[PDB]
Design a binder for this molecule. Structure first.
Ligand SMILES: [Cl-]
Ligand SMILES: [Mg+2]
Length: 109
């Protein structure tokens, strides 16, 4: 079956991808991405629509320095009902990401 390329994550469902990091530019590779589980139709749609924005935000953070290729540091971003985690994992080559439905706090809801 397919291997996992994204940021370590136990949430299900989850979209994981390993982005090629070149300078302050990020490159998405479909063959270096995949999904664990099944996204509701609503989530799959929001994931797809927000991906370009997410990419841009991550590059902004590279340009600004928040995301550093030589340091392990996890940043958090949001999108309609989705949580996006990203980290270079000090790889000096990539930005690993994990996007999943924001967990519901069942005990408070
Ligand atoms: Cl994992
Ligand atoms: Mg980092």
């Amino acid at each position: 079956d397919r291997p996992w390329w994204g940021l370590p994550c136990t949430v299900t469902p989850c979209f994981g991808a390993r982005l090629v990091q070149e300078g302050n530019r990020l490159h998405y590779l479909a063959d270096r991405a995949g999904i664990r589980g099944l996204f509701s139709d609503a989530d799959a749609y929001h994931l797809d629509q927000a991906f370009p924005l997410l990419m841009k935000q991550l590059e902004l953070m590279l340009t600004s320095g928040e995301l550093n290729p030589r340091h392990q540091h996890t940043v958090t971003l949001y999108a309609k009902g989705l949580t996006c985690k990203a980290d270079t994992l000090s790889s000096c080559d990539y930005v690993y990401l994990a996007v999943y439905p924001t967990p519901e706090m069942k005990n408070l809801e």
